[PDB]
Each structure stands twice: as structure tokens, then as C-alpha cells.
Amino acid sequence: NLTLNFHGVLRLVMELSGEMVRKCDPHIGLLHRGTEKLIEYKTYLQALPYFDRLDYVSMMCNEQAYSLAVEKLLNIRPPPRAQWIRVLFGEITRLLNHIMAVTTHALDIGAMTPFFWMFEEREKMFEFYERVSGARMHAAYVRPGGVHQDLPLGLMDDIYEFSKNFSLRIDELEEMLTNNRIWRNRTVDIGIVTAEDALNYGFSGVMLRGSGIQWDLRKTQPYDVYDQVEFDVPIGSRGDCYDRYLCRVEEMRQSIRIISQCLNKMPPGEIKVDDAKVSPPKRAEMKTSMESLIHHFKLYTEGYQVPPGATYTAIEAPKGEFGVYLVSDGSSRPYRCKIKAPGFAHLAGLDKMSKGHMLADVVAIIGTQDIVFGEVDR
Amino acid sequence: MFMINILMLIIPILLAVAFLTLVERKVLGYMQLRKGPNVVGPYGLLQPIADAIKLFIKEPLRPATSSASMFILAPIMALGLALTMWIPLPMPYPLINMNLGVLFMLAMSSLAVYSILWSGWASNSKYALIGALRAVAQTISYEVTLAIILLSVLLMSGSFTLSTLITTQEQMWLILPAWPLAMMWFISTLAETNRAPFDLTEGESELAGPFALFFMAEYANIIMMNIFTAILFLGTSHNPHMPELYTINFTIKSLLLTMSFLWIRASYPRFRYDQLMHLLWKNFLPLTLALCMWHVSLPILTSGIPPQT
Amino acid sequence: TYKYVNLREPSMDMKSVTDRAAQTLLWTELIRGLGMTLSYLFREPATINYPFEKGPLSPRFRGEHALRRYPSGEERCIACKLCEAVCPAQAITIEAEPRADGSRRTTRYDIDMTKCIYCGFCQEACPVDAIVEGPNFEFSTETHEELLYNKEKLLNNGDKWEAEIAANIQADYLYR
Amino acid sequence: ASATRFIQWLRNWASGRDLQAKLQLRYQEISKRTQPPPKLPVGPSHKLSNNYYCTR
Amino acid sequence: MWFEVLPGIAVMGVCLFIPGMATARIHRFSNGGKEKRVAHYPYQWYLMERDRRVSGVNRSYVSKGLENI
Amino acid sequence: ELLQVLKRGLQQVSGHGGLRGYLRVLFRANDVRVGTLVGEDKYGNKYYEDNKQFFGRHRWVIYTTEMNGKNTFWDVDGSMVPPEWHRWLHCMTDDPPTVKPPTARKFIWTNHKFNLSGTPQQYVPYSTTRKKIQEWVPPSTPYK
Amino acid sequence: GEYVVAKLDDLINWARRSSLWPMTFGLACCAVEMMHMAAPRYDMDRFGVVFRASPRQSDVMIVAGTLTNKMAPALRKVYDQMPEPRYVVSMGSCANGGGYYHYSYSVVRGCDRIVPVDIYVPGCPPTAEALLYGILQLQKKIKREKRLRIWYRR
């Protein structure tokens, strides 16, 4: 038993017998930054930017999950236009994540070219982030109550122009990998997980669907306007790395299908709840109306109070079920905020999934779980 | 006059290797929708010089080596052997005209594995020695097919003289009667030089002056394999009164084969170690043995046995 | 609604079996992959010639901070400390007193740019458009201390960048 | 968009796709970087009567 | 554009062209403007040694025709 | 078209005013494209556009060789772009300052400065507030 | 004797800044923007900056993300193993001074407590262009070195 001591940074303590992996012991905490404790010293608005920085590949999806939880405790709802923007940018965020997941998974096992092609596509999607929020990544754009600002004029046309060509970029990626015998040798029958083991080990997202489980929170527990768009849920059959890769590629195509509907069905109206005890008033109103200035002053200093209570809220994030257990004590700062990161349970399953495989397969299995250590360590 | 001739081989080889590093970075760049080096000199033409100077004035960090003698031997062996592989190459005239030139090249390349072995012994580390032993096991395995494929081809040539391959391909390239062997020959060179998708020393390890010398040796070998592939399978017609016409056509084929190494590196993922061993022992070797049998029989049954000389 | 990504039975007739045999022995899918990277070789690259060319940005871009003035030259900041209260990173430190003319003005206005998360919450909170994130993003330094901005530094940034900052605010204030 | 006809044919054939119809580089199809000013709508609570906060 | 890769390819091409061109030219210069004699077998070596004696100047590449008859 | 491609390459030498001007932009900017001169700022930077080029390469600047007393023939820096052209160069707007000049203010810097880090002009932080506790000063006349 | 030394500094300075091989500590978010600077739009390789190099061949360490207390000893170990000349670029607020986690019990308040830093790139994250500006600034810093001039005045 040869012992070896070695997204973020990971420490793998492994035991090998020849080529085989007897035990994988992930040692994490290398990016633990006490986010959950820091949030207890923030107002609800001040805590929002911490959620950009968990799964820092799916920023607005994390924002959405936190906003929905706070909206639930506030007993308000965001306006319909904000909900459509949140689904629109939620799916753009899904594309950002699967590009990162699929091409870096490919790059880690030597297939480096698709990374460069598809990161030019990510670069254009960062522009959409920056045009609505002024930041390429940590937008802090989706907030409890809706979104911070309305889409700039001309943005939806440019998203249409981008989406019209994307599936061809997916086709090119498939031409590199899908039928490649070398790619299939690295993924087929690697890291098989049974449907029953997947549920008991706490897996979610593609880690469940690759094994045939028919589960997607956007279909079964829909949020915002996901019940108003049409899409299919990709389902695997072998529960291995290859089927999960195919599930991710097909999910990108379905995201384009959703994005197309969001662009066409985008309604008019306001974009944050018309309730100035939760969402700040417009700047022009703040500068003319006494009530607006008082509410602006209080929302940016004390923040809004949230009725006491606890909620577990979850979304189908690109990496799987992402949730928060959010406890309010009635004040304007959360009492406790436990973040449920899907990668946490997935990485805990690495030892189980690596059994009977070789050292290089551990690289494929970590890649097929889509691990970002910002969400794993928090 | 001969010492002039030696230098007209050695110095250009090292120059070609230097600028292969530029060509590799730019070809890979453009296949990746980017440009690669284009700032350091016009079109990056000074990038190899900057890299070479930078490497040679870098701090030479020697960890506690187990054997000082073997720490110096391995790069000297690697570079000296790489340069030696070129002296029988007919371009169209060899520097040394060897009766058994093909065997000499076979004999010399089989010693190239010692520099891997000695560098693991010199690394003073258990994990580096283990990585070196995996590389050796890969290298010697693909030596098996290369030697058998080479023998199969020479049954059509009739000689171990490299310049006879030119005569053999006067009417037609050997790739036509022997493309199944050319296919496995070409893949074998990639795995032999530990090139992608067989770059497992880099892949497995991922999970100054002396470094540069090992790199130059490796890249000198990559060009030489592809020169050898061009002579073996894409023979250039030689006109004795205009030998430079051979050299130009010869050079173009060699450059194109060398860039196909680059093209391949940009296109595929990496093999698993056991998977590239299976590729050799369970796929190439069975088929090379059958084709060796076939190529022994074919000249006899067609009445196409080549002349001894 | 769902679909199967990989639920197919290969045809076992002789023509289909020979097609798979030809692919295995003649490496056809691998040759097809080489066609794709070859096609990219002859595509115009996506690289821009930085710093002679720049990546596109919008008026909302959150960059280096700056303190602004009214057209008269009076400071806009009135030391309300709303920016300091909202700052998620506690990157703002403010002190104030009545100025010699009786005006409500700051005597300290520091932003620790290495605490700051460039979230833009301060420019949303400001009631008078005094603190903004400007369009500059090329201000890296050789020392840590150079990134601990005091009021003088921030006012100079305002005087340095106001021409662009005023134009950007003009383009986006109707969205605020 | 400036590739010669021979090069366009070569890369289309090598990829097996008509790449010119879906270029990954952007040209004039994108929206102007100066836009007319917006006039954003107001929400349902922007009313002068029948709008007491205790009802919403 | 892709043709900006050619300069580096051109430098490599010229570098790989020099050894073959130089070897050929050095052979002609050293062998009276002819190809270097190839002697792989004893018969060829014997003729070359005979030619060196016949030349009268101890050079195998200096030929003698019917003017010595 | 192989001939037409070479003609355009030759036209770029003429477009940059001869071989010397062609080689100067090649070695300063690693790019020999000829564009339309949009304008020039007071520091000597020149601004070009070519809308046949793809988004991102359709606008560029050729930096001056001398700015605020610094030799910038080889040492160009992104911070050398003054704010009024910065908006146009980064495509925050479509209007160059020649067409839509910035609003004039008396306190706006007349002279732009580039990044001064690592020079004697670098910023050095300090506390901008005055001393808070005043010490008692003993009398200067003895009377113990 | 003095003209020669100045020219030899220029040569070695040119070679080192023209051939800057980075080791990236992709610790967190900022590593994503580093990947974008490698991606085609910016293509750091076109400046002579190789996409990835092992520490033993590295000239510059880019600290791209939050440095936790748990990770600090490992980051110092990698830095000590770099052959010289070696430079450190601190990228983003976390590495600069702790950023948004500055008050955390588990976070190093700036990577310059562990290693000497040559360049600080502000932002959360800095844009890929902002990182590239930082890298070019480091190149200018190397260009100002006068190692042989100081050596011969010793």
C-alpha cells in the first residue's frame, strides 16, 4: 500500500496498490474562509455578495437562491419582469458553468483545445454580466425583491445574437470529445454510482440524473417562472463519467432553448418589488419625496427587518441542489446562514466512487463531480 | 573539411529545435483561436532567443542528488545521443555513409532510455524514480513495434543502408504498399518520444540550463523521427546533378510531419498508462507480427525480392 | 419531460458491423477530430492587441473609486456615512466636523482598496452622487500601502476622471 | 469575415460545417454602444389613492 | 492570421535545409566536383584503392582515361 | 485572390507612409493595420477605427512617444489614455471626444497623468485628521 | 567597462521580462479571471507568458485568491522552491489584504505576510485585462533592474 499525499486547491491522501486506488481521503478546508460566521455580522443586503463568491462559477444562480430564501421569509414576491430576468440570467449562468465544467474536465485529462474555444464564449457572457451590473463575475445583481437595475437598451438583441450561434459551438465541442475513442476510454464506466447509492450519499443534479433518477428542482419544485418555459431533463443510463458528460452537454442545449423563450416572453414593468420597506426607491424619488429618502436612508443603514423564522430554500443550481438554511431572529441581520453546497456531498463520495479505479481515473472522477472549493469550504 | 561538415549539421539542428518551440506555440495558438508569441520580435521571431537566454541565467537549483556522476551523465547522454542519430541521415547524402545505417539508428535510440533511468537514480527521490521507471516501461514497449515495423519495410528495400530507401522509393512512396505499417509507425514515434496523447511523464508529474538541454535533446529527437518517417515512407526522388532539389522536397515533408505532431497534440486527450500499454501489447503488437509475416511472404510470392545491394 | 442521452442499441447487421470495424481500424473519428482543429487554424483569432486595443465595457462598469464635486467645485460629500454603513467589507472610514464655513464635511474619508470588493453598494447608497466607482481599472501598484486611499487621493481621482465619470453617469442614471 | 474564398471553402470542408453563417467573431450585428435614454415604468403601488400600505 | 506562423516555419525550414545542402557541396569540393565514392563492400574498396594508386597523386577521385594508354 | 491579398499587404506599407513608418508601427505595436484617423489628443496619442474589423479590434490607439516628460517610444502603458478618450476606446460610447466633447469644469485636470506607482510621484497614505488629545505643557518658569 | 555593463543589463532584463513563466496559485475566484487572461481574447502566451509551468521552472508566482491559514505554509513552501529570479504578483483583494474575509479567523490578511510581493492587482476580481496590465507592469519593473551595474560598483 503506497501512500501518496497529493476549482480551488485540494489535498488528496491516497493509498495505492500498484495502479489501483484503495482509499481516497480528501483533506479540505484550504479555502475555508468562515463565510457563514461573517454573514451573522452583515445585514441581509450586505450578505448577498458573499453568495457570488461560493460557487464562483455560477454567481447569479447563488444570488437567486439566497434572494428566494429572503423573499420567502419576508413574505413578498419579486415582480414578473424581475423573475424572467432571473431565469434568463440563471440559464446564461448555467452555460457559464457547464463550459467551465466540461472543458476544464477535458483540459485536466489532456484535451486542452476546447477550453480555448469555449472560453471566448464565456468572455462574451461576462459582457452580459458587466452590461447589467457593471461587473464581469460578482454581479451582486439578483437581490431579495428582484434585480438591482433594468436591462440596458440593446442588451436583449445582443443576447439573441449570441444564442443564435452557440449550439454550433456545442457541436464543435462534441466533435472533439463525444465520439473520440480516447475520450470515451477516459470516461466510459468510470465512477459508476448506483441510483440508490446516489440518493443515500446526498448527491444532486447531474450526479443523480446520470444514474437514471428523474429529478430536477426546476421541474418538481419550480421557482420564479420556470413553470412557464419548456425544456427536457437529460437522463443518463450507465451512471458513469461519460453519461454525466453527455448530460451536461445536453443541458447546455436546453439552456439555449430556455434562453430563447425568456427573450421572446420578457414582459414589461418594474424589476424590484414596489415595496419601499424592502427594495430601495428610485434615485429620483429618493431626491424629491420625504418618505422615499427616509426609506432609502434606513434600507442602506439598518436594512430591512425580516420576520423571525427559519427556511430551507433550494434551487437547481448548475452544480446541483444549492440551498440555504436561513434563520431570522426578527432583526435586520441573519442569525444563522448555513449554506448547502452540492459539491460538499459529491466530494464526500469520491472515496466510494474511486474504488476499483486507477490513479488517473481520480482525475476524471473529480472532474465529473464539478467541484469548486469556494462552495465546498465556504 | 569534415569538421566543417559536422558543424554544419550540429549548429543548424539546435537552431531548428529553438525555432520549433516558436512554431509549436503559434500553431497550437491558432488552432486554439489565438495567436501565440507575437510581441518578442516580429511575429515572435525573437521568442526562442529570449527563452534560451532566460533559461541559461536562471538559478541552477541542484537538490541533494544521490549520485553526482549520474546527475551529469544523463543530460550529456541525452544530448549526445540525439545529435548522433543525425549523422547517417541521407539528405540526400549522409554525413557518414553507413552500410548498416538503419541498425546504427536502431542501436543508438535503444540507448536513449538510459538518460531517463540515470535521472531517476540521480533524483534522490522515490517518486521521481518510480516516474522514471514508468517512462522506461513505456519507451521500451514501443521500441518493440518500431523495430519489427522497420524490419518489415526493409524486406521491400533489401538493405540496412538508409540511402537504399531512396532508391527503393524511386517510382513510388512506400506509404502506398505499407500504409498499415506507416500508421502504426507514426503512432509509435509519438509514444516513443513521449508526445501527446502519450505525454504521461508530464501528466503523471502534474498530478535552468540542464532542463533546457534535456528539452533540446527531446525536440531534436522529434524532428529526427519525422525525418526518418519521411525517408522510410515518403521517399524523395534524388537527382544527382541537383541535390538541393531533394533537400527542399525532403525538408518540406519533414516539416509537415513535424507539424502533424503539433496538430495531434492540439486535438486529443491523454491516454491512461495502462491504456497505452494495451494499445501496444494487445493491438499494435498482434497486428505488427501478422504484417511482419505478410511482408516476409509477399516479396517471395510476387517475385519482388529486392537486390541485396 | 426528459430525454435519454445514451440509450441506443447498435445495429448488428453486417454492414453496420463493418462500419464500426472500419472506424476502429482506420481511425475515422480521430481523423474527423483533426479536421476540426485544422478548420480553426484558418479562422481569424479572437485576440485583441492589448494595450493598443481594449476590451469593451459599459457605463455601469465598477472600477476605481473617486469623490466628486458640484459644478461650483464644492464637494458633493456631506459626511452622511451611508456608504460606510452599507459597505460589506467595512472598507470605508469616515470622520467629520463642521467646516470653518459651518458646512457638513468630512475630515477623513479612507477606502482600503484591499478590503474593498468593488460591489458598488457605496455609490448606490450615496444620496448626492459623491462616491462613485469610476471607469479606471489600470491602477495596480508595487506596494500595499499605495492602495490605502485617503481623502486627498480620492478627490484627485475625482478631478482626474470627472470628464468620463460625468458622461457615464449621464448614460445610466435613468436606469437608477 | 475577411477570409479569402479558398480559405472559407477549406475550413468549411475541414469542419464539415458552414462556418461563415455563424461566425464566432462579432461585427456589425451587435447593438450600438450609444443608446437612446430609457423611460422605465413604475410599479403597481405608484398610485395617488386606494393605496394604503396596510393593504399591501 | 494563420500566415503569421509561416516566418517561424521558414526559419526552421532553412535550418533543416543547411545540413543537406552543405554536405552535398562539401562532398563535391572534396572530390573534384563529383559525388563522394561509396564503398560499402570490399570489391568497391579495392577499386578505390587501385584508383588512388593509378591517379599518380594519391587521390582516388582523380581519374585517368585513355590518355594513359 | 492570392494576388489581392498581397496587394493589400503592400498597401499597408504605403498606408503607414513608407517602409520606415511601416516598420515603426510593427515594432511599437506589433500590428501594421491601416485605419481611419479618428483624432489625436494633446499628449500625442492617435486614435484609429476600422469597422470592418471584429468587435474589439475595430478601435485602437497608437501611443505617443513622449508623455509628461517620459520616453514612451517603447514603454507604452494603458493608463496613458486620457479620460475623454478612455470612454470611446473601451466602447462605453460611440462618440469620440472630437464629436461629443466632455463638459468643461474648472477643477478637472488639464493634464492627464499615467500610473505613477514606483516613482517619486507615487501616492503615500497618511492620516488626514488632526491631533485629538492636547497635552498639558509645563510652565517655562521654575517654582517647585 | 560601463557601457558594456549597461548593455548586458539590457540584454538579461530583456530576456527575463520577455520570457516570464508563471506558476498560478488558483486559490479561488480570481483564478477564473486568470484563466480568461489565458483565453483567446487576451492570450498571455503572445507576450511570452506560458499558460502553465511547474514551480521548478517558474519565474513569477501569481497568488489568485484567498489565502487561508491552513494553506499559508504550502504557499510559502512553493515560493521557497522557486529558482531565482522570482517575483510574486498578488491578484485581487483577498490576496492583497484579505478583502471580504479580512476579519475572518481563518484567513491570512494579505499574502504579503507570507511572501514578498512585487505587484498588487486591485479588484474583486480584477478583470483579465487588469491582471494583464499588472503583468506588463511587472515586465516594466524587471526592465528597470540594474543588477550588473550595482555588481560592478561594489
Ligand SMILES: CCCCCCCCCCCCCCCCCC(=O)OC[C@H](COP(=O)(O)OCCN)OC(=O)CCCCCCCCCCCCCCCCC
Ligand atoms: C491483400 C492482402 C493484404 C494483407 C494486409 C491487409 C492489411 C490491411 C487491413 C488492416 C489495416 C490495419 C490498420 C492498422 C492501424 C492500426 C489499427 C489499430 O490498432 O487501431 C486500434 C486501436 C485501438 O482501438 P480501440 O477502439 O481503442 O479498441 C480496440 C482494441 N480492443 O486504435 C488506435 O490505434 C488509435 C490511434 C491512437 C493514436 C491517436 C493519435 C493520432 C491519430 C491520428 C493519426 C493520423 C494518421 C497518421 C498517419 C501517419 C502517416 C505517416
Ligand SMILES: CCCCCCCCCCCCO[C@@H]1O[C@H](CO)[C@@H](O[C@H]2O[C@H](CO)[C@@H](O)[C@H](O)[C@H]2O)[C@H](O)[C@H]1O
Ligand atoms: C546563453 C547566453 C547568455 C548571455 C548573457 C550572459 C549574462 C551573464 C550575467 C548573468 C546575470 C545573472 O543574474 C543573476 O542570476 C541569478 C540566477 O542564477 C539570480 O540568483 C542569484 O541571486 C540571488 C540573490 O539576488 C541568490 O539568492 C540566488 O541564490 C542566486 O542564484 C540573481 O538574482 C540574478 O541577479
Ligand code: SF4
Ligand atoms: S465598492 Fe463595495 S466594498 Fe468597495 S467601498 Fe464601495 S461598498 Fe465598500
Ligand code: SF4
Ligand atoms: S460619500 Fe455619499 S454616502 Fe458616503 S458619507 Fe459622503 S455623502 Fe454620505
Ligand code: SF4
Ligand atoms: S478577491 Fe474577490 S474574486 Fe478574488 S478570490 Fe477574493 S472574493 Fe473571489
